[PDB]
Symmetry: D3
Subunit: 294 residues, 6 copies
């Protein structure tokens, strides 16, 4: 049967997942030692169980990554039948190639540390680059928020039939042209001094990318989109990291709303920013766990 | 502890140019097929203690050349070679780099694992379809760019290059073309299939389509037709990998290109004989230089700012 | 009860016979090639939690079938199948199982490592060239014998079998023929190349050459004529693997065989059209029984003493 | 090959001291964190064909320094280094070296395997909590001793060292002090919970263990040693973790000195605690690096110091 | 539930028989001998397809022959399509070589752990590892069982003055073990380290406790020191009864009232030639570990209680 | 630049000493004993840091203690920062268990190859593997040396009538070993098969030489010898590479009808020669020493297969 465990990163999403599966949380004490070493004490048997550990790459990332690895190692030495790392926001994903001299491929390093910890399956959401599925030798589910983003647009944008949907960088063109084609609307591209390609005159601009970290690029992209004359600017990003001065920049930018999923906890950031709206996706992870559980 | 260079049956000319630029001959290897079509590899010289480089591109009957490459690596490895480096100009199975459909394979990662398990210690390639294939291994992977030699070609061959527009034939290729456009200080544009859509205005100016490869060339021929319809003085196509499979030559001859420019990661002499529009950017000096720097133990970053020769 | 059988492009007939004998349908898989000759594999039905068997024989265009097999294994493995078993009746690269020359590869071990790294958990094959290839893995390898079905054939079709002579065309095929001689209670003989030399009798007796495979068939045709010039009644040739590459068919048409008997580890339908001496032994029930017993607990030890049907 | 030594963000002073003692400068690495708290590592000079040494101790925010160390190892490995050696003065997660509870992790082995897959070919550390951690790998792991340097400190600083009594504050540490007391040919003692076994009457008492974290079990162990009547009490621990309430407890305790090595930085601790003294072990690590480079035996560093 | 098979090696057949008997099973059909040239011969005479296999081999009596036999049995079961192969090793061999305390020294214990891993072992069940950190040699579950509950029950039921005894360590290495026992009995402890004794064995009973007894030189010299310090009776309760070389002669001449070991190593032949040696059948602790590991329960019971 | 060291195990110190003498080296400082409880104790009393280490241990005389000793020495040198560890094993143990011929049978040879691999061996140097395919049980270079040269030289220098002798295989499995030797001598050949013992070939009126790779209990060579005399041969010799002579072997050869029984010193023969006057030994220490010298440097060992230094 199923045991779902939660790490100290995003207890809310784990609770939603376990509720949707009709389970309890697997009882785990997750803290730090006096000298900041990660302390993981699982307080119930997992012998013969299919265990799922929910830990997102957010907060103090290395503590949560190491916590996840230690939970995997404990469950593996605990004679668990299978250990699955549920990672809604995959850490170190932007370091997925050697783009400069002597650079590390940190995402690949993370994939190998999960492998040697004892992970048998990975369930994640909107990988920055899909090719990260190839960093392993085990099944890696790359889930999409695209149905939930489409539904959010259709249910919240009055003028969605005549929007355009825009990318703030180059790399995000393929992500955008999908949903633009799925809504049957135009599309546009913003590149870095900032240049705009496409027609967003007298319509609604929805910026879409996989992630929003410092939000400098989407804020200057919204400013370019107002320069080109757009009745309203939205930003729908899957992972709402919001690091550093991000909140200040979205509060001063001219967005109608800024939409993210709950791959990362947003309550405290939503308290300091009124434009933020969060989507479900917890039902998408539960169905990947239940589908995985044969 | 010097260099031994061997050639596979997938591109002996490129191996010949590389060994020539390095002041070498090429290793004595017989690479044929058995009566029942099994690969036969006979290394005809000692390779003990040598730094071996094997040149095999993903082209032709791809699985025969891939299997030949793997057998060459394994023989050299149990031949007590000091190091074995697979130089793979066009990396095969690169478009199968993820699990997009329901039960699809990641063939590129499988290939990376067969190269790893054969005994490869180093990979030297050019313009990987996805750069993340460098992460499919646990060994160094040089992802060489043809971008500098393409820039040099454009400047030395395009009269109106100062006011051209670099166009991406698909969505996915926007990063490449904005890189090149930023390097020439020109404009860029994008074409998206669905009717085919053009964004970025290429009116009354030269249009250069740039992507990593040309297989069946349907997408770049349709893109070129759209560039004419939008009113573009001239339309070029500069692609790194000249696969040209199927009706590709028919489609390029029946399109409106002034030239279609590729590198010699794949043999092009037979293709150029049947298509007066195809131009080749010899990149054997970039591969020869990367091998030499790899041997000495020097930094290959020079190869991303300047063209040799 | 959770069993799936997928077929490659090499021996679809044998796959259908096996699935028929197990009362199953073949799994939904599209297995073709891309425009640039890369292998294209989409398994079109779930294998989640299933006991998967992939039947691909080492024959035809061998490297395309090997890559197809590896891509199917890796796909099923990433598709969360419980176990993936490669049913390979004729093992490719099996004759390359040692280092006899100064720089030779052990291609059989390379293949064992590529099947292992793809995700294979079990191997089911028939009459390995060398049995020690079982040790090239680290997973169970069922090496089935055609010996019982050959014994049944010899008993039921050769009238003078009680006083025949089982002959080896080379050395090393001595154990194969001595086991059949001890099991039929008959005589054995041996032929060594070096002008060919025969040791043993065959005078005024039916002669039966037995080996594991027949590729170019030069040695068994010269062996046949030597057996007639030593004064033998007839000459048969019973080989497990048909292959028949190169000029083999032409040579069998001119040789003096009464019959050439093979199993259907390799398709023989096209071969039988051009050679009237070729008779085929259906071994689909031995492979089907290996699969059904492998699914359940049940020991495969049957398939080495008596024939299923 | 030629030697390059790199520093992590943990204990930069020890890295500089080591590089100076080897007559080298530290290599160019920028090691910081991203806006979203991910580790950023940029090695700014070629290491192709080099024998690289990366000095990172298990201290401070340990998971950030461990993850940073792993990223440096991986970068140097893809940067075509000839050999990558992790110099780790204090090995993190070492106290998780066995399974004494249900569902417990063996975090020390997890770290050993992450170092292995990162690309480490050699490990140089000092006084592992348990020596058997050398077996968590399949690559050379040097477990150096501070014992000659603590002995030299104690002969050179304790006048009554000829007639002292070395004490273990817990059970598990009974062998270490027998290795040291017998090396001084002096009395030894033991404390368990507190009850004391061994003599400590009018003698002066020297606590020796591998660590001292929060120091509760050595502050109480000092109180028991005074109650049994010893002139002064000395605490000599290898790794100066001093986390949590450690400083307050030593400031309110009756130590003559608390001596640690510089496997972990102590400067911030020493400005706030007059009782902390540090032993320089930078030459003991430098000599193992030098011997490891040009192929000598580090056995000498367990009996002679520099 | 029952798809389990249990097999024996050539080392401790009595323990194998007791374990299988306690589980209500018969021992599996394996012929285990040596070839003419002294190579190990292993013939499993029954199917293990889909089975949860347990192989009982202790590190004792011609160690390399039994270790190599164990590895060959694991590999045979692995190629025989067993679902899981568990090595039950009551006394884990080469455990004293668990670190590098010398130049050019081997970690023989780690080598053995890697040979068991590469042979095909999926699980290890052992008792009183010399060092518990050997659990970290394996990357697989390793049960490190204790004789501590059975040693305490034996003490309470056989030492009358056990409430005022003295649990003594024969070397500096058993201080963790004996304090544990000392705390469980609520008694005093002592240590012996040239003969130096620290602790107060007053005029009472001294019980030496360690993990094993090989030659028995240390427990006997510790017994002499415990005499000279004036102690009533002295005992020795050791988990692993290796007793090699002149060990029995030295126990017969030493001042022991009794010397108690477990049956991780065969002791019947040893007990016939020494009236002092007593054995604590621990076959039920191993059987209940096999039974719980099959059908997947928690073995932590076995450290608080002694099932018969 | 000699970084070469050479240790010896407890199995064959004489052969190690001859090898090191021929290489102009001293034997490495190793104490190899047993603990009180019969556990293997290995203390290397010399640095091997950065050295090319060779450990000479043969599979003979109490196999498991010598195998375990070899493994502990490899592991010690590997953790001792040795540059490379090469296991020089003249007689490779467990070679006869190289396949699964019965149900639940072990492939002990592959297990041994995996324990040598996991100990840290980078190279294996052996002589006359029972099956050559055992080279594929590894993933590291394995030199399979032949005793065929020096056996040819022995026959020529000791048998007067060798120009018309007959090389006989005692079993159906050594026929390839025989056919080789005979072709190099240009002599007849024959084969013996225990079915009742049967002889195939001609050995009437001329000298007969039984040749196989080893002699364990010697049960077959002796009955084959009486068969060779009942079939009428002047003399009978027995030349085996590996002189194991276990069990009743010496008792059987002393009453056997051999002119001589010739073995190599892959196994110590001194005590065996004391109890059997018919035993001749061939020194192959120069073939092992040359395999080591060429393996160290970087030279083709393949000379050793037709020359005899
Ligand atoms: N992972 C895990 N280990 C268990 C469980 N139950 C028992 N163990 C065993 O417990 C041992 C270590 O903890 P344990 O002995 O129970 O703690 P102790 O009884 O206080 O010494 C190992 O042998 C584990 O195999 C369980 O449910 N999960
Ligand atoms: N790879 C390689 N192998 C060599 C070389 N020189 C000798 N060999 C050896 O040659 C052997 C195979 O060639 P050969 O002696 O003709 O085979 P054999 O006579 O049938 O055993 C192998 O054992 C190799 O180790 C060399 O330069 N390279
Ligand atoms: N192999 C396999 N993967 C599946 C199956 N069903 C769903 N998936 C996975 O589910 C994911 C699809 O979700 P998404 O891309 O967000 O639409 C893919 O990554 C697949 O790997 C199945 O039947 N087989
Ligand atoms: N790790 C490492 N990579 C190097 C070194 N020298 C050159 N490189 C190469 O630098 C390449 C980076 O390519 P690119 O994305 O164009 O970065 P660029 O070299 O700065 O232009 C990598 O693919 C490496 O092959 C080196 O010393 N170490
Ligand atoms: N290990 C094992 N092998 C089995 C079992 N049942 C059948 N086998 C087969 O046994 C074969 C070798 O033994 P066997 O068939 O009896 O003798 P053979 O005539 O040499 O094939 C292998 O090819 C296996 O496929 C089993 O339960 N366990
Ligand atoms: O373009 P499609 O033929 O649709 O897809 C494959 C394309 O691959 C290359 O980009 C060619 O230009 C082909 O057109
Ligand atoms: O030897 P060839 O005639 O050329 O090739 C076919 C032979 O291949 C093997 O030797 C078989 O015995 C076949 O008779
Ligand atoms: O003392 P408490 O258990 O906090 O733990 C801290 C101890 O950690 C080690 O034992 C040190 O000697 C410290 O005294
Ligand atoms: O006493 P020794 O002969 O030195 O060695 C064997 C005995 O002492 C050792 O520590 C073992 O524990 C045995 O108890
Ligand atoms: O005669 P056996 O008992 O079979 O074994 C000893 C034989 O072992 C070898 O294979 C030779 O044929 C020897 O004569």
């Amino acid at each position: 049967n199923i045991k779902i465990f939660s790490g100290s990163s995003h207890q809310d999403l784990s609770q939603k997942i376990a509720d949707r599966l009709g389970l309890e949380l697997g009882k785990v004490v997750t803290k730090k030692f006096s000298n900041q070493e990660t302390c993981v004490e699982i307080g119930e048997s997992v012998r013969g169980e299919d265990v799922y550990i929910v830990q997102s790459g957010c907060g103090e990332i290395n503590d949560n990554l190491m916590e996840l690895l230690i939970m995997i190692n404990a469950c593996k030495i605990a004679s668990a039948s299978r250990v699955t790392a549920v990672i809604p926001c995959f850490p170190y994903a932007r370091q997925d190639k050697k783009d400069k001299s002597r650079a590390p491929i940190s995402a690949k390093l993370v994939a190998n540390m999960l492998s040697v910890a004892g992970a048998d399956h990975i369930i994640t959401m909107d990988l920055h680059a899909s090719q990260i599925q190839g960093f392993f030798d085990i099944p890696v589910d790359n889930l999409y928020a695209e149905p939930a983003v489409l539904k959010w647009i259709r249910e919240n944008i009055s003028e969605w039939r005549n929007c355009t949907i825009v990318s703030p960088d180059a790399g995000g063109a393929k992500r955008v042209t999908s949903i633009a084609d799925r809504l049957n609307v135009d599309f546009a591209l913003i590149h870095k001094r900032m240049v705009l390609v496409g027609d967003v005159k007298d319509r609604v601009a929805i910026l879409v990318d996989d992630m929003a970290d410092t939000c400098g690029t989407i804020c200057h992209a919204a400013d370019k989109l107002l320069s080109a004359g757009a009745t309203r600017v939205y930003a729908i990003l899957t992972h709402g990291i919001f690091s550093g001065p991000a909140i200040s920049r979205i509060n001063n930018a001219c967005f109608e709303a800024v939409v993210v999923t709950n791959t990362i906890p947003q309550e405290d950031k939503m308290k300091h920013c009124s434009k933020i709206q969060v989507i479900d996706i917890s039902m998408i992870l539960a169905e990947a766990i239940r589908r995985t559980h044969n």
